[PDB]
Amino acid sequence: AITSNEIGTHDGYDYEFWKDSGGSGSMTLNSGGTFSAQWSNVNNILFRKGKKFDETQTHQQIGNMSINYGATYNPNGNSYLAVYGWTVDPLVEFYIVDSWGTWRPPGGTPKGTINVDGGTYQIYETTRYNQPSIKGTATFQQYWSVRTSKRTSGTISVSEHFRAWESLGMNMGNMYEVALTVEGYQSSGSANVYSNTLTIGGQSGGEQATRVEAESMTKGGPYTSNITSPFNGVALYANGDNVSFNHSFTKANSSFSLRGASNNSNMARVDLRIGGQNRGTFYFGDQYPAVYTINNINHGIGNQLVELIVTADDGTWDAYLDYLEIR
């Protein structure tokens, strides 16, 4: 188990054990975002699993963030169960607090409220003076959403809290971290985070797909032509043959579902380009229409050219495209 200050990555999750002097603590890393934690007579201790970022992107450029979790939470004293993290420039430490121990943070007078994920959260801003931080000992703001009532499982719509904060003039810097966290202050306790899933990009299934028919896109290359069999669409015959269109991306992440087929039993390959960058490859294994989905593409908000192009032709297959759906 982890019993001293440590940073690492475990099962894809950036994890961190931090405590100052005094007391003891133990963190056991389990699969996914999950972990168990124990602490005894600490001054301050934090156990967390989430994502560290490279400090270059705002949370909008990263995309929608959502955390679904469940914890058996047994604090004995001051403690928080929260989504926790940092921004830089400005340096901000933030909390989305779902449960706590003996004291409901953070004191002071609320700046507003948000109703989300079936609960009500009051929003606060505080100041830490010469306190430890990711940039050394520093003075910085803390941002809080604190539930009006305790819960130890559910979904936290992190990006909703972020927008609520910014709407109240709590300006956020580039993201450094987002992580489900167990914190202890002048306390003891234990906790078992048996479920912790951080999702970037995806949401709800009906927030509404856009389908663009291949025959309505712009044709390019030597031979691209319309076809009516095995569907209404286009054929890409040679290297350079492509179809393209400008898409207005609302979010920063999308799934791309291309309905197509080879003309025969040889595998056809179609490259995806967004804004001039190759972002992946659709595979059509045979002559029967099928939908190939490339998921979790971070492309950023804005109007960008989507290009579907043949680059590996050798005369043994053609690519037939019906439509592309962006979700």
Ligand SMILES: [Ca+2]
């Ligand atoms: Ca702290």
Ligand SMILES: [Ca+2]
């Ligand atoms: Ca003490």
Ligand SMILES: [Ca+2]
């Ligand atoms: Ca061909």
Ligand SMILES: [Ca+2]
């Ligand atoms: Ca079509």
